[PDB]
A paper describes a structure:
D-Glyceraldehyde-3-phosphate dehydrogenase (GAPDH, E.C. 1.2.1.12) catalyzes the sixth glycolytic reaction. At the boundary between the two domains lies a catalytic cysteine residue.
We have determined the first crystal structures of SpGAPDH at 1.50 Å resolution and CpGAPDH at 2.55 Å resolution. Both crystal structures correspond to the holoenzymes with the NAD+ cofactor deeply buried into the active site. The conformation adopted by Arg233 in CpGAPDH allows it to establish interactions with the nearby Thr180, Asp182, and Gln183 residues. Besides the overall alteration in charge distribution around the adenine pocket, the most significant change appears to be the rejection of a positive side chain in CpGAPDH from the inside face of the adenine pocket. Taking into consideration that many known GAPDH inhibitors target the adenine subpocket, the non-conservative changes observed in CpGAPDH may have consequences for the binding strength and selectivity of GAPDH-targeted drugs. Whereas in the S loop of AvGAPDH, Arg209, and Lys210 stick out toward the NAD+ bound in the same subunit, in CpGAPDH a Lys residue substitutes Arg209 of AvGAPDH that points toward the protein–protein interface rather than toward the NAD+ cofactor. Despite the sequence and structural similarity and roughly similar kinetic parameters, CpGAPDH was not affected by the concentrations used of either inhibitor.
Author numbering:
A (entry chain A): 1 to 331
B (entry chain B), C (entry chain D): 1 to 332
D (entry chain C): 2 to 332
The structure:
Amino acid sequence: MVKVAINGFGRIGRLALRLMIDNPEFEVVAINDLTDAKTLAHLFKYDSAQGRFNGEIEVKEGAFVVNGKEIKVTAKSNPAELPWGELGVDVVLECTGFFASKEKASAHLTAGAKKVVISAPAGNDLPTVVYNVNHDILDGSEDVISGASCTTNCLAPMAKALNDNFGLNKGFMTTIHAYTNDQNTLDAPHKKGDLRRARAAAANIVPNSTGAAKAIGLVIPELAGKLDGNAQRVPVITGSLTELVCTLDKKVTVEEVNAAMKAASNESFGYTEDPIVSSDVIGISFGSLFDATQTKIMEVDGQQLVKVASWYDNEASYTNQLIRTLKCLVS
Amino acid sequence: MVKVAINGFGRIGRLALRLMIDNPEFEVVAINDLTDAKTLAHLFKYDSAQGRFNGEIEVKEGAFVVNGKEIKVTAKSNPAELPWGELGVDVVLECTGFFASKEKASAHLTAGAKKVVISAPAGNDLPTVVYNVNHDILDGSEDVISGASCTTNCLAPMAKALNDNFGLNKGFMTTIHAYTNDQNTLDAPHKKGDLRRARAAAANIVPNSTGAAKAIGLVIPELAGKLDGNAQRVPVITGSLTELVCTLDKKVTVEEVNAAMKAASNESFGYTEDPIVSSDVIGISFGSLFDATQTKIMEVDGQQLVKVASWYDNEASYTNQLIRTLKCLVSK
Amino acid sequence: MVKVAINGFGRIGRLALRLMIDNPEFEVVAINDLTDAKTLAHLFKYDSAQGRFNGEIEVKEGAFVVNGKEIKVTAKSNPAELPWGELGVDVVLECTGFFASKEKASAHLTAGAKKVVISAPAGNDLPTVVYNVNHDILDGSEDVISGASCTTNCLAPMAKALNDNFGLNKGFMTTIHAYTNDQNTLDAPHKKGDLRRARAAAANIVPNSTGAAKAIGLVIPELAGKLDGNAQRVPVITGSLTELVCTLDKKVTVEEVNAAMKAASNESFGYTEDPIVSSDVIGISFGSLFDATQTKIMEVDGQQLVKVASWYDNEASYTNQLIRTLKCLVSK
Amino acid sequence: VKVAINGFGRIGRLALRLMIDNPEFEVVAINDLTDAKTLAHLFKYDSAQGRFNGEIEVKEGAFVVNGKEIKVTAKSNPAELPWGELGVDVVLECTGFFASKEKASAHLTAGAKKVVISAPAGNDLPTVVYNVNHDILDGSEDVISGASCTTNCLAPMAKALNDNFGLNKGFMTTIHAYTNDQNTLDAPHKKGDLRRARAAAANIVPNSTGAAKAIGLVIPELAGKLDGNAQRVPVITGSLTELVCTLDKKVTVEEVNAAMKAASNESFGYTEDPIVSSDVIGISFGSLFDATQTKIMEVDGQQLVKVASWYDNEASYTNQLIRTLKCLVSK
Ligand SMILES: NC(=O)c1ccc[n+]([C@@H]2O[C@H](COP(=O)([O-])OP(=O)(O)OC[C@H]3O[C@@H](n4cnc5c(N)ncnc54)[C@H](O)[C@@H]3O)[C@@H](O)[C@H]2O)c1
Ligand SMILES: NC(=O)c1ccc[n+]([C@@H]2O[C@H](COP(=O)([O-])OP(=O)(O)OC[C@H]3O[C@@H](n4cnc5c(N)ncnc54)[C@H](O)[C@@H]3O)[C@@H](O)[C@H]2O)c1
Ligand SMILES: NC(=O)c1ccc[n+]([C@@H]2O[C@H](COP(=O)([O-])OP(=O)(O)OC[C@H]3O[C@@H](n4cnc5c(N)ncnc54)[C@H](O)[C@@H]3O)[C@@H](O)[C@H]2O)c1
Ligand SMILES: NC(=O)c1ccc[n+]([C@@H]2O[C@H](COP(=O)([O-])OP(=O)(O)OC[C@H]3O[C@@H](n4cnc5c(N)ncnc54)[C@H](O)[C@@H]3O)[C@@H](O)[C@H]2O)c1
């Protein structure tokens, strides 16, 4: 049994609990956030995007019990003050968005935790892993690691397949992304000074920056410095699409590209020929779902520009990858 | 030339500035918030609901200039620390949502301001004004006042007209309300513990509490304790509807009720027979817009239940009412 | 083993199919619509509100196979031309919205069908059933019956409980309703000339008329002519709320009313004290979900006004009620 | 100049809004499938473009706008309309069903002198993007096309790019507001598109567009050099055209932004403000280049260039349409 704590019971943290609660390999001992147990339990029970929790929840003072299993609730904003050493937690899932670095997240280790998995990009001085792309880099000795971004978990398998089959010279990624909690409800100042994430999330197409493409080198070293891109946040509650426009080493046809993708398909990376829309990927277990209906190739003179697209649920896809990586790290 | 400050450059503060900036009676000296001048200027220039500002904005350091007039910007979370005295500010529009009480809002007076107008309900010990309903209660000597809530400004003229013409013994109010910034973007803990405002604003029907009906007595004393109600927040960016289901002292007809409403119509209280929808009231100047097409009467054993509905833009309707009450207060 | 055809593979039809593949008592022989099998199969596999279908779907010329069982696809706009006798269908689920009457829906019988369940109000010359309110009236002699409206399936159990415990003299219903396929995507002319459903569905609060309250007289005869109401369509994809403001024959308390509701709770009528929002009822099997957090009472001069509310998934709640009524009709 | 409108839809009603205070045209008639009460109500109130600034009165079979009367008809077949009896000078074909010379010429048979089609209508006629190729107009044209909204956004941007640096090839992606050809909720679709069948306001909906492939009709040098697709997202109006392209010359972000600013005109605007989609609702530009979204990535000696332009797919296109209308009749 592996003792896990969750710091930051948000979209990712709560969905992580949903994925770990039924699997006997883990024991979620505690959850830390900024609120009381009643609030945490209600948010776990009811979800506007992922549906009702299938199980039973009851709340007790300073704790709540899910499926008969009790979980201590704490409210410490400073991780070094947490009781990880006292409950002897094995791994902390750092899901707050505030401690995404080796320096900052290591406060969990000083608090007594043996290992930490960060739910975001956390710099380049620690292992960053996209499951079924580079999880082989783990040997079990790593105290703090990053599960990368949702967008890298969508893009990496696609870019790796393209590079391995045809060699990818370069490309531009644009992700049409569901809005998230870092955007305002209505136009208002933003905490980090972003004048676009300041705007009403569900009423706008909101251009935004993302480093997923520039940082791919941390996951696929061969592609370091070969991709860039940005995002457009749009008014869907969850569900996103990654488009990649690129040039390859070899002339290709749509059929050849789609076949390479199907051949690279696994549990993390899926393949579909159905003309789906975003609402159809909510809650999927794949980290990436390649959409063969969106493959397009244009040729001028002898040079090809290739466009590919893969769906992902920035919540469920990422969290499933995060739990795959958590299982690998503790094995 | 009245020296105004705005504390909290939010939805209401920015729309207040929009309504005062063309207006010669006010000079807006300062704005206080929690961010820098470039952010306030950007948010004033571009609006997701109220459209782009028609005018020119330039950003200096620590201030910005609107249509050639400079406004100093400050970022002090504690109002008592504000430089209202040194700027000789006459009225502060308290629009943050954090000082809506006599005691808390009086810190502006301690900061050196002469008067404070609060843009929300602020308790029972202060004058609360819905313009063109009870604004005669103002005499000019009041240092702090409340402009009431958006729902109170929509409901009050409707309930006053019904009471005056037919006697309103009791009623229930329901406001189908646009979501606001006190609701979360996606499901998440909520600062004030509301498990319903914690849910994703633009994805849900969210029942919520409101004191607009219970507190109507502060605006229409004859109606103290005769109304109650609640809200349903729904996914529109702005624009709202107040429904009132009530019993009256007098049998009435649809035509009678509608005529009573039109007869009470003014700049604050409007009347329409067009089958409009919420997006059509965005930016209107009325504090309340009675919809004669929604009037319904049901009679059982000779006893009637009456349903009426009035539209409002919870932002522009309220802000226009607030500037009306401000002008009246400083013209006194 | 009862052979069922579905006419109109829409929101109600497709969800009916989702619920009947579970039940071995039915076999769905055919589906009729205005399009091909590829599209019907695709729309059945993927749903923006009710999620992906968990099961297997394959497409065949003029048919598609679900969980290994084949279903015939037809595209005849006129029901009299259907092959119901050839297929010997026992019951047709009439879900198009165009044949909602005894006279029009009897064309299914002329095509050779034994019985018709209309998924909408179909007039007062028919048996209209809200399961677990008046389904005891069914005896097997009925060629055509109506499953009533979604809103009546939400309101009836609540109104019945109120009437049974305390006597319901009169009441006004207001439903806060998800938008539907009879509203336009963007502002445009409307097929029925309604200037409000002509407006952009996902951008507005849209007042609308409904007979759900008046039609309660067909399901609860004691309450004939005692209720009326209206609707407000709001930008959620599915999930709705029914509010009721009413007067009773007896004085009551909030907890007394809530206790009566919990007591009347069953498979069709659910009871909750959780402060839920609309997205939380998507896909529920109840026809009505009474929300104890919304009960309120107003007392003035000793006469009370009572406000209660029930949630419903206007799609799944109604469809589950519809399948319950269909099983009841074919069991007799 | 006697202007009539066939199809009082999103484009038609906004066109009338723009022509009310233009002293050179007077609108004489409007044809649609509904009565004057509905048309007047839809002209008065609009969910995206706000209330009409003016007074509307509805007479018998006509309505008066700001004192000026306009008769209304209900003919689904354009050949049966009384353009001859009304001596119409130019008809705006805005239904979406007669987008071809052969079909739109029925206006000519009813007695219409000139027809401007508010959509792409084939290669047999002049298709014009104002301030891109409008000088091709002389007096002699009875039928012309105003192109698509997406072409009116892309064309000036692509032209500036070609003229300054030479566009080898490019892939366009437009993040587009949903439109009335998408379903409100999931349901069969009349043209069989399984994606436009899905609920418009709940999904990211990939869609095809010919705006890129057809650019050759507006900029002949670029025939067969661009392609692209669309993504429909839940905003009521407002759209963004992103272009990923390769150029003949090596460039810098500053060079591209300067070349765009140099091309600035009433049709093609320039901004460095970090705006969002709702900020372009109702703008008078056919295209608004966004300098904040320019990106260049370089691998070996080869560059990929990304640029983006906003447009209000309704107001931008309609403003362009009436500009082309004025030009067409000046001659
Ligand atoms: N949401 C996504 O789509 C997504 C996808 C991939 C990665 N991530 C990453 O996951 C992390 C969490 O994101 P989220 O979407 O779940 O956001 P969220 O806002 O939903 O979750 C944040 C939670 O952390 C809690 N928290 C904040 N400060 C805290 C502190 N000092 N101590 C304890 N708890 C605290 C908050 O109260 C909130 O409950 C972020 O770094 C995000 O970048 C998010
Ligand atoms: N939005 C409506 O529909 C509406 C209608 C009528 C009244 N009101 C009331 O107006 C008030 C403001 O609401 P809003 O909708 O504009 O909300 P908002 O969140 O958009 O505005 C809040 C603003 O106040 C600022 N702020 C917070 N604390 C501050 C402090 N200590 N000092 C300076 N600035 C601070 C924030 O940075 C933000 O700019 C609330 O009390 C609300 O109840 C709102
Ligand atoms: N959706 C709800 O919330 C709800 C609730 C209760 C009752 N109902 C009732 O159910 C009925 C269907 O509604 P819906 O929401 O599923 O609408 P919908 O528009 O999704 O379904 C209509 C379907 O019927 C098909 N159709 C139309 N005419 C036809 C014909 N002549 N022959 C064969 N097929 C035809 C259409 O192609 C479409 O697929 C309506 O009467 C509605 O009022 C709907
Ligand atoms: N909406 C945009 O963003 C946009 C941009 C550029 C071009 N267009 C083009 O403009 C045209 C109209 O699009 P829209 O957005 O106005 O759609 P819309 O659905 O709002 O307008 C269609 C109108 O035409 C009427 N109509 C349909 N058939 C008719 C007939 N036979 N006779 C007379 N009237 C008829 C309908 O009643 C409706 O009022 C389309 O061809 C579209 O491609 C649209």
